[PDB]
Amino acid sequence: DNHIDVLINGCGIGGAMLAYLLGRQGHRVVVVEQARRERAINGADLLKPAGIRVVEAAGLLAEVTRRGGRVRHELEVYHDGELLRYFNYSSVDARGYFILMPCESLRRLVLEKIDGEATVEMLFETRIEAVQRDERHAIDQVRLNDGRVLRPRVVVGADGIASYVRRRLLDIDVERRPYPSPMLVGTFALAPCVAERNRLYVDSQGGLAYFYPIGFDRARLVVSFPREEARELMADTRGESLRRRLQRFVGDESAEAIAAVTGTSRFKGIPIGYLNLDRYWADNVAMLGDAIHNVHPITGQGMNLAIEDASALADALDLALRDACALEDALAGYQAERFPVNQAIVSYGHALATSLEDRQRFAGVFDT
């Protein structure tokens, strides 16, 4: 009646994909999102092979490239201007390729599919107000800020790095530790060199610049420098100090990409955390994506891991909701499958970010 299978807090890329996968299975899903639907959150751009498998299982892979997603299989990494590593991800495995696809492009696609799933109801500009638990400490009722009351079998935090579900429903507090270098991303015209190949540049002074195409006709430039330097560089908004700083460690192959940086004003900061929560669930409440882990954005994997979590959670929840197994066993299974994968990328990110300056150490991180 007001009984539903799953109440998903947050309709980000993780939450959307979980809602679609559950809705495809005929589960009764309510998604609560505080923002308006059209609010575009720019975000990560990368899908790695495991994420691509989810997209492919959702029936979405063709539409990803039709909407500007790009299949790639190479990366060059430079340190102090010289090539350190070249990676061909498909040299052994034809499916080793990755995809560049803006988070918001993929989320809009998924939302279009949800629009046709009659068992899913998406509520925008809506928030959870209060919950009630039963004698077994499972949430049994949820009231929303519009006055709507629901009775869900399962509550999911897909609500991102400041997860309400984590903080308020599970009462978990997370220590922060900021990094000393921020990371910022800007969008520019696309140079032939960027269209050709992804190139990452780092230097012994702690500079980083990563150039890669996005969409049909744009390029990203992701940069990082120590905080005060980064501030000075972004202050000069016609961009001359940044172009010059890039020229110190970015060689001729990417000269046109550097010339494409006409200004600094549309650079955006990127969140940087370090987390992998030792529990992904309690009672009938589970979490995914940035609610449970924060990887250094140097890895590129924030969206990708949210999508991998979503798929594993949809599998585990489908089992529970079908009565193939007890919810606690299904949630325990979700955690065992995801935790080691998320942990490895969280460790890898931190190892990469802290080893920039040291050419040998940085190459060693790539290899291991």
Ligand X SMILES: Cc1cc2nc3c(=O)[nH]c(=O)nc-3n(C[C@H](O)[C@H](O)[C@H](O)COP(=O)(O)OP(=O)(O)OC[C@H]3O[C@@H](n4cnc5c(N)ncnc54)[C@H](O)[C@@H]3O)c2cc1C
Question: Least CB distance from residue 159 to ligand X, whole Å?
Answer: 4
- Applying CB under 6 A, the span of 3-11, 68-76, 211-219, 233-241 interacting with ligand X comes to 3-11
- The verdict on 202 binding ligand X (CB under 6 A) reads no
Q: Are 203 and 210 in contact (CB under 8 A)?
A: no
Cβ proximity to ligand X, 264 vs 299, nearer residue: 299
Find the binder of ligand X among 22, 109, 185, 219 (CB under 6 A): 185
Contact, 13 vs 40, CB < 8 A? no
Tokens 């928030």 correspond to: 127
Angle between helices 302-321 and 327-353 (to 10 degrees): 170
Q: Which residues contact 286 (CB under 8 A, 6 or more apart)?
A: 154, 155, 156, 157, 280, 313, 316, 317, 331, 334
Residues 309-368 that bind ligand X (CB under 6 A): none
Which residue number, 102 or 239, has a Cβ lying nearer to ligand X?
Answer: 102
Cβ nearer to ligand X, comparing 190 with 345: 345
Q: Are strands 285-287 and 199-202 parallel, antiparallel or unpaired?
A: unpaired
Which structure tokens are listed for 79? 């340190």
E-strand ranges in the chain read 3-9, 29-33, 46-47, 70-72, 74-79, 82-88, 98-100, 120-124, 128-133, 139-144, 149-157, 183-189, 199-202, 208-214, 218-224, 268-269, 275-276, 281-282, 285-287, 293-294
Q: Is 174 in the site for ligand X (CB under 6 A)?
A: no
In the complex, the smallest distance separating the C-beta of residue 287 from ligand X, rounded to whole angstroms, is 9
| Pairing between β-strand 29-33 and β-strand 3-9 as defined by DSSP bridges | parallel
Total residues interacting with ligand X, rule: CB under 6 A: 36
From 295, 314, 327, 352, residue interacting with ligand X (rule: CB under 6 A): 295
Q: Which stretch binds ligand X (CB under 6 A): 113-121, 154-162, 229-237, 320-328?
A: 154-162
User: Is residue 273 close enough to count as binding ligand X by CB under 6 A?
Assistant: no
Q: Which residues, including other chains, have CB under 8 Å from residue 220's CB and lie 6 or more apart?
A: 45, 185, 186, 187, 188, 210, 211, 212, 213, 214
Determine if 33 is a binding residue for ligand X (CB under 6 A).
Answer: yes
Q: Whole-number minimum distance, CB 149 to ligand X, in Å?
A: 17
**Sites for ligand X among residues 105-134 (CB under 6 A):** 127
Q: Does residue number 37 form part of the binding site for ligand X (CB under 6 A)?
A: no
Does residue number 308 form part of the binding site for ligand X (CB under 6 A)? no
102/303 Cα distance (integer angstroms): 9
337 is in an annotated binding site: no
State how far the Cα of 33 lies from the Cα of 114, in Å rounded to an integer.
14
The residue assigned the tokens 């987390």 is 275
Q: Please check if 239 is assigned to a binding site.
A: no
Nearer to ligand X, 5 or 309 (CB): 309
Q: Which stretch binds ligand X (CB under 6 A): 91-99, 115-123, 143-151, 299-307?
A: 299-307
- Chosen residue from 29, 32, 139, 272 binding ligand X by CB under 6 A: 32
213 is in an annotated binding site: no
Q: Is 42 in the site for ligand X (CB under 6 A)?
A: yes
Q: Which of the stretches 143-151, 155-163, 201-209, 314-322 binds ligand X when contact is defined by CB under 6 A?
A: 155-163
Give least dist CB 296 to ligand X, A.
Answer: 7
Hey, which residues does 44 pair with through a beta bridge? Answer: none
Q: Is 196 annotated as a binding residue?
A: no
Q: State the pairing for strand pair 208-214/218-224.
A: antiparallel
CB 33 to ligand X: min, Å: 5
Q: Helix 227-235 and helix 240-247: axis angle, to 10°? A: 130
Residues in 239-268 at the binding interface with ligand X, rule: CB under 6 A: 268
The reply on whether position 167 binds ligand X by CB under 6 A is no
Contacts to ligand X by CB under 6 A: 9-15, 32-35, 41-44, 103, 127, 158-160, 164, 185, 222, 268, 270-271, 289-290, 295, 297, 299-303, 306
